[PDB]
Amino acid sequence: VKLLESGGGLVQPGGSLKLSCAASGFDFSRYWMSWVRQAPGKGLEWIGQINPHSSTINYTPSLRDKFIISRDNAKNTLYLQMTKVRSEDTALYYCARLLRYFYALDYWGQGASVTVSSAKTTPPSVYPLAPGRAAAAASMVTLGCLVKGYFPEPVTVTWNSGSLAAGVHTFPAVLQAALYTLSSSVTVPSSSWPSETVTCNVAHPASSTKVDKKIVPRAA
Partner 1 sequence: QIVLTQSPAIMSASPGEKVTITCSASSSVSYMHWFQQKPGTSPKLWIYSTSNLASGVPARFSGSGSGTSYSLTISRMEAEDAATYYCQQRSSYPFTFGGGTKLEIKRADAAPTVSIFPPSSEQLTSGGASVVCFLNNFYPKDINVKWKIDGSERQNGVLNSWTDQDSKDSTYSMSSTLTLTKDEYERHNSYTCEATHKTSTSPIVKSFNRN
Residues 102-141 close enough to bind partner 1 by CB under 8 A = 103-106, 108-111, 125, 127-133
Between residues 185 and 190, which has the closer beta carbon with respect to partner 1? 185
209 belongs to the binding site for partner 1 (CB under 8 A): no
* Residues whose CB falls within 8 Å of the CB of residue 160, separated by 6 or more in sequence, listed in order: 197, 198, 199, 201
Residues 82-101 close enough to bind partner 1 by CB under 8 A = 94, 99
Q: Is 27 helix (H, G, I), strand (E, B) or coil?
A: coil
- Residue 103: HSE in the Cβ half-sphere, 13 Å Cα cutoff: 2
35, 45 Cβ separation under 8 angstroms: no
Residues 16-75 close enough to bind partner 1 by CB under 8 A = 36, 43-46, 48-49, 58-61
Tell me the window of 70-78, 82-90, 142-150, 154-162 that interacts with partner 1 (CB under 8 A).
Answer: 142-150
199, 153 Cβ separation under 8 angstroms: no
Per-residue x/- track, 147-166, partner 1 (CB under 8 A):
-x------------------
Between residues 74 and 135, which has the closer beta carbon with respect to partner 1? 135
* Residues whose CB falls within 8 Å of the CB of residue 43, separated by 6 or more in sequence, listed in order: none
Report the alpha-carbon distance of residue 210 to residue 203 in Å, rounded: 4
Work out how close the CB of 133 gets to partner 1 at its nearest, in angstroms, rounded to a whole number.
8
Contact set with partner 1 (CB under 8 A): 36, 43-46, 48-49, 58-61, 94, 99, 103-106, 108-111, 125, 127-133, 142, 144, 146, 148, 169-174, 176, 181-183, 185, 187, 218-219
